[PDB]
Each structure stands twice: as C-alpha cells, then as structure tokens.
Design a protein around this ligand. Sequence first.
Ligand SMILES: [Cl-]
Ligand SMILES: [Cl-]
Ligand SMILES: [Zn+2]
Ligand SMILES: [Zn+2]
Length: 272
Amino acid sequence: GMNIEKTRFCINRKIAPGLSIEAFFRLVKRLEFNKVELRNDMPSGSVTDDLNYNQVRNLAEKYGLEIVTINAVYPFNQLTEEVVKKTEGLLRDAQGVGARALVLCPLNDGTIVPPEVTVEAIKRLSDLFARYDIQGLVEPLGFRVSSLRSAVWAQQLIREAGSPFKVLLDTFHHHLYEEAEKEFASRIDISAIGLVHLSGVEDTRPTEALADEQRIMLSEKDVMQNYQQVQRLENMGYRGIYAFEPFSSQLASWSEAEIEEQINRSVSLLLQ
Ligand SMILES: [Cl-]
Ligand SMILES: [Cl-]
Ligand SMILES: [Zn+2]
Ligand SMILES: [Zn+2]
C-alpha cells in the first residue's frame, strides 16, 4: 500500500521509561532504525540522565543514531526570564548531545495568549536558537485549554515572525482540535511541517475528555485515524520523519521484547 522508507521512522524515548539511554539506543539499533528523540520529562528529570554530553554523543554514534529532537520547552508562549533560563539549559542539552531540533509547546492552562505575544515569543526564540544552531519545532496542543491548537494558525504566526521554525504535527493533538478538518487540506503547508508525532488511542471516552495517559501505540482499534492522517500527508507530499510518541503508564509494564513488538506492529500497520 504505502511505501514509507524505514529510514524515515523515529523512536521517541517516551516509549521506554524503564530503559537507560544505552539500553534504549541498543534497542532502536536492533530494530534497524536510525532516529530517536530525547526528553527532559523522563523519570530522571534529565535529558542525559546521569550521563554527560560526550557519553551520550558516543552512544548515539556507537549505535548509528541521529538524535532528531529534544522534548520540550514549556510554555514557550509565556516567555518570562525563568522560561528563558529553562530554554537556554535545553539549548545547551541539544547542542551537547548533537540534537538537531528542540520542541516548543504552548501554554496550556486555559488562559489566552494573544497572537501578538506568541509572535513576539517566536521572534525572540528564533534569535536565541540561532545562537546555538538548533532548529525549532512548534507543537500545537489540541486540548481545549491550549493557547495554540491549530497547526495552520501556528504556521501563520511563524511566517509573521519571519522565523525558520517549523510545525510539529502530532496526530493526537490534531484529533483533539475538533475544528481541524475544516481548513486542513487547503490551508496547511506540508513543507513547513518539520516532524510528525504518531500514537494511537483505543479509548472510546469522549474526545473532549482525552488526555496523554490514553496514548499508546497503533492498532486496528485506533480511534484517531492515524493511517488516514499519515496517508493524507503522503498524498500531499510529506517526505519528513514519523516519530512514535506514546505516553500511557501502561508503557512502564512493557519488556524490551514487548516494546520491539509494538514498534514493529505499528510500522507494519502503516505499510499494509
Ligand atoms: Cl526576527
Ligand atoms: Cl525579536
Ligand atoms: Zn529578532
Ligand atoms: Zn507530540
């Protein structure tokens, strides 16, 4: 059916909360992928756990992996001087491990952030990121309490900011933005989508009520239409990276074998 080069798949570290960085990298190489994402919200609380930057670089190189992003700055949108320090720390982390991009997430507490303020934040962060030679990925969050839910509108703000940043399209967040399908096909710029985050939800609770805890991997029981969201991207010309990003606490109970199975099962579902 769909011909997606295996090379284009990326494994986000959220899938493996119980694995050290070397165990995680070794698994991804065993599965013959060459892309990962690291994160500052693992149990360790550190992008590199207790390792230094050099150790992490050597590991990535030992297992032939590109670290594609770090997740994530929050809230990029409410750029106080604490948030700037928190971002500078993450920019060092990205530069040090050899990460290409750092992910930016909008305020998500039910409070309005005006588009003028978001644009100003993108401008300031674009200048700051350039200083570390890191790419920025703006990820809209679909929650009703999110200050920035539309990928289309996010792309517009980036243009107004004159920024090289791109949008991170997350299929869960698209699914929760329930006004999303109206504009999408006509208004989205595929070339300005820098990464895609995939995960499935089988949970049949109302879409309004869905949270990250329901986000598992891709099955036939998936409620969010990932196959169709991916098929559309392919048809509209997307040649970028698909990264698997589950969040559920069910993940912690998975062995290294079970993790390998779910990544294989998810990939196979897309190529069927
Ligand atoms: Cl600027
Ligand atoms: Cl500026
Ligand atoms: Zn500027
Ligand atoms: Zn995501």
